[PDB]
Amino acid sequence: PVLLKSTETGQYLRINPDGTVDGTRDRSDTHIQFQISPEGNGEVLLKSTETGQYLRINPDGTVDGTRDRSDTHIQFQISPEGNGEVLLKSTETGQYLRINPDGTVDGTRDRSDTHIQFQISPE
Numbered sequence: 001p002v003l004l005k006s007t008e009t010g011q012y013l014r015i016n017p018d019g020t021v022d023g024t025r026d027r028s029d030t031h032i033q034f035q036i037s038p039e040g041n042g043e044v045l046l047k048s049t050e051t052g053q054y055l056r057i058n059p060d061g062t063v064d065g066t067r068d069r070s071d072t073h074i075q076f077q078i079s080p081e082g083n084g085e086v087l088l089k090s091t092e093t094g095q096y097l098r099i100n101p102d103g104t105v106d107g108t109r110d111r112s113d114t115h116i117q118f119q120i121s122p123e
């Protein structure tokens with residue numbers, strides 16, 4: 001498993017069993033563990049290790065978890081950002097995953113937003 005941490009706020013992405021997605025600094029939470037798996041030849045899915053849910057950025061910018069493997073909004077591209085940092089971009093909507101300082105998680109098309117930078121680390 002890997003962890004997905006917001007560089008700016010030091011919060012880890014978490015998919016809760018209720019399907020909501022938020023950020024936490026609780027390193028002991030089992031729900032911050034992810035598996036990155038291939039989808040076709042150029043994309044990835046980001047799946048919760050403990051709940052089996054996939055991260056989804058909806059067209060309206062909300063971010064939640066789903067187990068619907070047919071959903072077209074669970075596909076991501078990971079793009080290097082210099083240093084050990086990456087952006088996590090929805091292929092379908094062109095939105096970047098963002099963790100806000102209040103712990104909410106959402107999507108934005110603004111590539112200059114400081115809250116879209118992530119560091120991926122083995123657990």
Ligand SMILES: [Cl-]
Pocket residue numbers: 100101102103
């Ligand atoms: Cl905020």
